[PDB]
Amino acid sequence: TLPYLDPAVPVADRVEDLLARMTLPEKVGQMLQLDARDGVGPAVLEKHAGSLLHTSPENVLAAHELTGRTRLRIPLLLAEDCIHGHSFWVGATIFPTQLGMAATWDPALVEQVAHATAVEVAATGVHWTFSPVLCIARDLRWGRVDETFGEDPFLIGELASAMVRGYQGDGLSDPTGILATAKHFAGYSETQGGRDASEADISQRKLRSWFLPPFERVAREGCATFMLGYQSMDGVPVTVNGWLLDDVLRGEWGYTGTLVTDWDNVGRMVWEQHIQPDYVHASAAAVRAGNDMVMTTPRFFEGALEAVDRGLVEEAAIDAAVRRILTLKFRLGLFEDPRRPDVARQQAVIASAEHAAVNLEVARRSLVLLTNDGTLPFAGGLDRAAGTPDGRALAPAGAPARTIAVVGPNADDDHTQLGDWAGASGQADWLPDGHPREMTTTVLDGFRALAPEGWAVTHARGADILTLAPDQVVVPAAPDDALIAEAVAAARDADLAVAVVGDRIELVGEGRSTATLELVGGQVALLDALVATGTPVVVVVVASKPLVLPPSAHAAAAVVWAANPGMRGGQAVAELVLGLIEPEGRLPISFARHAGQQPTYYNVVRGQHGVRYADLTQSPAFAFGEGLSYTTVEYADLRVLGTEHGPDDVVRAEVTLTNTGSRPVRETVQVYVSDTVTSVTWAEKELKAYRKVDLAPGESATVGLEVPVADCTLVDAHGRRVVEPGEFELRVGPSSREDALLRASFTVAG
Amino acid sequence: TLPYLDPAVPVADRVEDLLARMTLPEKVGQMLQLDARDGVGPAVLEKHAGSLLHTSPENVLAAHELTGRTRLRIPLLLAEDCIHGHSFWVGATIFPTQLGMAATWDPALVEQVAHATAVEVAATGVHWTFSPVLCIARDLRWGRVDETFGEDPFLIGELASAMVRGYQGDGLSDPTGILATAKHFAGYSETQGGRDASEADISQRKLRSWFLPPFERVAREGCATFMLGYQSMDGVPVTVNGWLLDDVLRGEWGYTGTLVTDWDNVGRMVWEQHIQPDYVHASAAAVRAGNDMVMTTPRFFEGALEAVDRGLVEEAAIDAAVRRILTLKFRLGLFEDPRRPDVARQQAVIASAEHAAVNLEVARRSLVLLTNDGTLPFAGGLDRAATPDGRALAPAGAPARTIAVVGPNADDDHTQLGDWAGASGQADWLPDGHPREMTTTVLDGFRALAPEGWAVTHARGADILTLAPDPEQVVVPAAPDDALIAEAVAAARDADLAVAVVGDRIELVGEGRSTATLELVGGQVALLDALVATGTPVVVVVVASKPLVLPPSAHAAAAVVWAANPGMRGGQAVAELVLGLIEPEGRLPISFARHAGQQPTYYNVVRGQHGVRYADLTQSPAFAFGEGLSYTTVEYADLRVLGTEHGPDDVVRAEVTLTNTGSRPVRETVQVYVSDTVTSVTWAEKELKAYRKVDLAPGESATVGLEVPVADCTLVDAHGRRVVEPGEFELRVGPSSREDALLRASFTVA
Ligand SMILES: OC[C@H]1O[C@@H](OC[C@H]2O[C@@H](O)[C@H](O)[C@@H](O)[C@@H]2O)[C@H](O)[C@@H](O)[C@@H]1O
Ligand SMILES: OC[C@H]1O[C@@H](O)[C@H](O)[C@@H](O)[C@@H]1O
Ligand SMILES: [Ca+2]
Ligand SMILES: [Ca+2]
């Protein structure tokens, strides 16, 4: 012999030979992507599924056996959520979440993480990850903020671009490449009330302005698949959204990759959004819109078959989607090698020492020091034994004996440190105990391993967070006088209190947005009492997203943001506190002071009558881009080199940095552009470029910076992204805070 | 002639005659509406103003003198903010705010309020009020919620229809009629962060769906003017928004009334929104867009002149605006009678007893009893001497009782009247407000009504705030004050009943004063906690501009009454209610959030959310649209649609049975909601469409007939058409918008 099995025959002729042999049920089934946890046998044999997701190691082997017993033996696409490492493979390298990764501001490193993930994913026989996420974190109430790269369209685009690159490798023939997905297209991250898949009140212009740019970038860079979002947008779910699917993705951008829906998009139009009377008309609606793969709506099988039989859609429309799906399977070479899992390759590459070292680097660079009164680096900073890199620190001069008290509900919590979409977070049913405990260094673990011989590390759970009850629902723990008293005693007998607080899985993710953003349970009372002991308190926030921190945390000696820092995360936190590394992370997202303060992202649109709420400043608790080091850096003398520009030029600038302190630093210079007068109201400023700079103590450097004129765009009325001629301002400094930015005018001419 | 001064000439010829005699500066000035507080002389003489606003009684007289000294003697239009009564005339009848009035659910009463306002306004020689407000209260953080009729489009349009009817009388030749204004067209109430005139992220379909219906209703019924909103909508300020102005207002609706901008709209495009480079260009943009009157942008004078001089716009464009302005003045008769103020009329009609009786009806019927554990009516309820104004009589079994009236708003007569009244700050000729004797505070109410044997004591129990310069003008919350609390606690310990009057005040309300937390500010929470702990029963009376988050102690107090700035008679109504001299009738026109992060909390939420609650908080409102208690129980029984199959010209007809099962009469407000079961686009779960007031004596049953025209069961589809889609519906009927309180019956539209 048959031509569809002949590798010497062109792919389009192979497609048409196979298609002509297929029954209509076999074609509809090729559009299904089914939940393997419900049983692989019926899915592959009775429904005739093209794809499976959530496939346990046992079911991956069973799926291949069942394909051999089907009439046409069309090989399966096996897809999995491999969200920050290979989430659901016991013993895989689990990296920080996307939000933590974004604090490194380092695309080259994020590419290494995606590549290391793909290497592990490929060995287990998975072909396709639903990753990266390109949603833009605009409402902190939203439960999936941890899955984003933050609040800035440019930074999201840089890092999402790096993940697609690293996942896909050299392309559809790379044995260590896998398909990447551009996820939640588009606008899923800003819906009414910060709720999960409520109405998105987003116009075409607002979508183009703040949400589309990362998607357009990865579409043009060859992202294999796009995933269509849950939410209705101006009344229309993305699944049947003609403007978004035809005018934008397939029209303006000319995207030729494969579409997949999100879990049960087609059925939700019946039972949750109430825009379709039944599943036959939902299926027909989905086919008209030009969908390819339909995820976890099993009744699309009988619904699309009946829709064809009744004349609601043509069989030709089924054919066109099947032609696209088969083309992908043929170009991957699956009919020649369907990329089975290889146990010899699993043992060679999964959780290898190279991958662990990439993981430690991301953890070290993702930590963001938000406040410091001088307590840190603790005892002036520690050294390791001169002979051995790594290993336990030496007791420094001026501090022979110290006691560090590690307290708080997240101080020794394996699962919470890894976050959602990993281990036992709940979406896979084959990892009851999560990943092996010994692969994670918790905060307590890290200090026990690093503290000098003559020091001591004590522990006390100081609070609980929550318990579950029936209306299912979270019950916040009460403050617990005994639990608190035990931590206060540990602190009273110590030189330093490290309080590790935050959230946990029942307060995070799908269907679990939060309204208050506050620490839940007895954590506030624990922080209050620890600060009142007079022992210096370091607040380490291990949480999925930015939280409102109580006053006692702003009165503590220091505050570290860690964002679910992965398996190495607790080694990095202890290294940071003891001064064995310098801090490098910088916020990719803003922290609010109260949920009602929002919006608190840096790129606010101009126009407000006033600058504050009557009962609250509009200034965020911590702003996008900020973060401390253990030294001081002066920014001086910003100059644009030739302030007049035409539309094809590059704005070029120079700025001078001086390290005026005593420790080295890797500084992240941020470059914002402001369009002084605009034809439609626009953001006061936008991030456009950035640069990392290494400074030895005392070193001084003049740094070149550039921004193409073509990047100084807005979305006008009419929805065109255009550079308008006129006056601009270049704002350069260590954060998005206006009192930290040097500024310089430039102009762009018609 | 001179035929312009000739009343036999038909108006179009008079306009043409006068237009041909006017120089260009005179024609531009006729578009100006200027701030008389800045200087009436230069406004009429140098700038040839066509209208004045914020005119004091002295300046009203001076303006008529100055007109007579001009070349062509063109009569001025004098306009004022007459928002709930004649706001800034010392001392007119000041009614409850619109938000308070809306709790009466009574358009006939609201029309009486507007007619009475208009009689007083006309005697003072104002021709035009900037009222009613048609914004929809969809974010509780907004500072101007008190100016709206709540959160529902239908009720808003009922009550604003009534205000326009009452203001305008029999038309332009009515001596007691004045011009109404449909205010803030459109979308000003829902902008980012709840802030004042931040960006409105509102698509065409969202605006058509929830904001436009009341504006379309009053434009169709003859509202004489429309005011264009401050805010930029999808990047375009309303002032230059061609879709809104030309396609919708002047296009689909064919509205021929007069337009005015809001305060400094034209100039804000330069200095606040940054969408115009200078005032010449701002003035040209405003002319091209079709504006009529330009409010408080004095530089529109030189700017529009330089714009014509440079050919940016044609003089005929100015001409067309003047024609519409002059046509109004002629039809008003202003050239034969400029409608001067008349002191004898002022003394005959302002604050007459008939207007005080209307005001007392509104205040009585607007209080909303939110909670009651049985403590109210107090001591089982009191009577008057069989003497409808005098003191109440001590009841059987309670010859001496002491009521402790406490709280910062218990005797604060400025906060009771609210924003847009007296000394709120927008007029500058009444620095002491209205005459103190015209206002009954809550304290005044109990002192005047308690029986002879009873006593009434008083303790301010908390302060709210003080002011301070910004810590780079600013509100500083009062700290809890132990001596002040102890004094109130001692009064409550010596009383039978403690009435705690709490809420907000002017520095936390209105323009530029949005709020983030919605909580009670200052020492009020500490006060309530302490009063509830005495063991004396506590009634919380909320005097506030908008719904607030109440502390847990308020939810544990015996009863809670919502008063929303109840006007000059409001303290009499509160006391009558607590003592049982009236029955409660009010019903909430807006929902109360439990936390600012819980929003949206309006009842008519669009379907689609994955989940029903935040992980840390229910989405159930603290109190919901339409609810409110009485002093008896009413049972809703047997809801029947009369024939279920309908066509687009039909009326849906239903009946429901109500039984008063308690001891006291009640005026019950039956609410009728319609749910469209399957919609072509995502829609609200239900919408209010009718209501009905039913009087029930104790023990009385009634079978009440309800009806909703089939033409009202619309949605806004994709394409932006408001249509009734065939399919299944549900009629939901009951005493509130809560689902567990609604009977349901389905009907079909073919
Ligand atoms: O009140 C006039 C008109 O415009 C807006 O209110 C204007 C308000 O603006 C301040 O800048 C000024 O100091 C106050 O005196 C002034 O009244 C408002 O949005 C409209 O409701 C109102 O009709
Ligand atoms: O993708 C993983 C998850 O997606 C959700 O929508 C489903 O309800 C979960 O049960 C599923 O495991
Ligand atoms: Ca510009
Ligand atoms: Ca319908």
Side-chain angles (χ1 to χ4, degrees), chain A residues 37 84 138 161 172 208 245 392 477 485 494 508 528 531 539 630 662 683:
Chain A
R37 300 168 311 163
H84 50 102
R138 305 202 106 208
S161 158
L172 294 187
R208 296 178 183 281
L245 290 181
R392 201 175 285 287
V508 171
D528 293 349
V531 177
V539 181
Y630 288 148
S662 96

Side-chain angles (χ1 to χ4, degrees), chain A residues 38 75 87 91 126 165 354 367 381 392 407 413 443 677 688 731:
Chain A
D38 277 351
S87 306
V126 171
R165 261 198 309 286
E354 298 99 295
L367 296 183
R392 201 175 285 287
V407 301
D413 190 347
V443 178
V677 183
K688 292 306 182 170
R731 305 181 181 165

Side-chain angles (χ1 to χ4, degrees), chain B residues 377-418:
Chain B
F378 181 66
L382 283 61
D383 299 309
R384 307 185 131 108
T387 291
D389 186 331
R391 288 192 181 276
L393 297 180
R401 297 288 185 277
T402 288
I403 299 168
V405 186
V406 301
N409 290 351
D411 203 37
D412 188 329
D413 57 298
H414 293 292
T415 303
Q416 183 167 320
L417 305 188

Side-chain angles (χ1 to χ4, degrees), chain B residues 558-583:
Chain B
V560 173
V561 177
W562 164 253
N565 306 127
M568 283 174 342
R569 313 300 302 271
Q572 180 176 340
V574 172
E576 283 168 345
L577 177 59
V578 165
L579 300 183
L581 304 168
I582 64 184
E583 327 294 330

Side-chain angles (χ1 to χ4, degrees), chain A residues 690-708:
Chain A
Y690 62 88
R691 198 184 169 179
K692 277 161 184 301
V693 185
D694 285 339
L695 298 178
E699 186 185 347
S700 204
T702 285
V703 186
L705 307 165
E706 56 187 62
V707 175

Side-chain angles (χ1 to χ4, degrees), chain A residues 141 193 195 513 515 609 613-615 681, chain B residues 193 199 514 516 597 600 614-616:
Chain A
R141 290 177 300 175
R195 305 163 187 180
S513 312
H609 299 14
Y613 297 96
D615 58 353
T681 55
Chain B
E199 180 86 2
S514 287
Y614 297 95
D616 57 357

